[PDB]
Amino acid sequence: MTSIHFVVHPLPGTEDQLNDRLREVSEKLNKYNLNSHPPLNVLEQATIKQCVVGPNHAAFLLEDGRVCRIGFSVQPDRLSPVSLGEDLQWWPDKDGTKFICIGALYSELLAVSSKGELYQWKWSESEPYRNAQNPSLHHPRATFLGLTNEKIVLLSANSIRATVATENNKVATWVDETLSSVASKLEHTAQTYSELQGERIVSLHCCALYTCAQLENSLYWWGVVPFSQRKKMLEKARAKNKPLYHAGAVAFSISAGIPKVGVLMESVWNMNDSCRFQLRSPESLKNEEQWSLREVVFVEDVTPKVPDCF
């Protein structure tokens, strides 16, 4: 038995604001003791293993192998401040899937079954993926990842990135559907690494850039190198020879809470300088924004060799 509460904390701020919001939710729980929301009343009685929050919805996991989704939106005039959806949509259960782990992505969700299958479906639509040609295959990227014949034991997710570790100690990483033009660099299929000594992968966590795995007595991180290290390498490559980036190079950013892919108009000379970018709309693959220099990735991978940002 439990009760569900919501709170909103504006991102640029200090820990004091977070503590103040937690204080407010505690006071609401104690001083006033407001009634529970009927839409989540059923979910209150059920135990919870994990919960994830998407860009616009939230997904709850059950100990009985059940996953549910609900809609939320935060209004600025009232800034519970979160207005929830009128109705909650469950997971269509066939043959008792009995999921284990869940994760949230910008364009979809991710689930792991008891046998292990990356069940997923987008936030826009309302049905789990159903391949007509292969009714036993879900997550059309599953074959490309190479996880269609393995037992998934750990899953981790962020807005754009996802990673899965199987029982065979193989870590497979990829990005979201929106970020596809850069997938040639950030994606590794199912593969065992000699860095992992073969012990049971205790935990896997990831962020918008890289991913860290916790073993029994070690932490191993991989992905994009930190921006401070990127700047250090850039200043230790061009300057030591005594046009950092050519124009028209594509990249992606997670600025303002939305991952967007765009090109750069002019070459960058000073790394700390903020450069304008030309937005590349997702529909254009099938307007002008001055992106922050630090959040840009420069995925184009553009005398000794150029330092690698990966």
From Swiss-Prot:
Location in or out of the cell: Nucleus; Cytoplasm
Phosphoserine PTM sites in chain numbering: 80, 281
Tissue-by-tissue expression: Widely expressed. Most abundant in testis and expressed at high levels in brain, pituitary and kidney.
Sequence positions bearing N-acetylthreonine: 2
Domain notes: The UBR-type zinc finger forms a pocket that mediates recognition of type 1 N-degrons.
Subunit (UniProt): Homotetramer; composed of a dimer of dimers. Associates with CDK9 and TFIIS/TCEA1 and forms a transcription regulatory complex made of CDK9, RNAP II, UBR5 and TFIIS/TCEA1 that can stimulate target gene transcription (e.g. gamma fibrinogen/FGG) by recruiting their promoters. Associates with the E3 ligase complex containing DYRK2, EDD/UBR5, DDB1 and DCAF1 proteins (EDVP complex). Binds TOPBP1. Interacts with PIH1D1. Interacts with CIB1. (Microbial infection) Interacts with human T-cell leukemia virus 1/HTLV-1 protein HBZ; this interaction modulates HBZ stability.
Entry function: E3 ubiquitin-protein ligase involved in different protein quality control pathways in the cytoplasm and nucleus. Mainly acts as a ubiquitin chain elongator that extends pre-ubiquitinated substrates. Component of the N-end rule pathway: ubiquitinates proteins bearing specific N-terminal residues that are destabilizing according to the N-end rule, leading to their degradation. Recognizes type-1 N-degrons, containing positively charged amino acids (Arg, Lys and His).
Family assignment from sequence similarity: Belongs to the UBR5 family.
Name recorded for this polypeptide: E3 ubiquitin-protein ligase UBR5
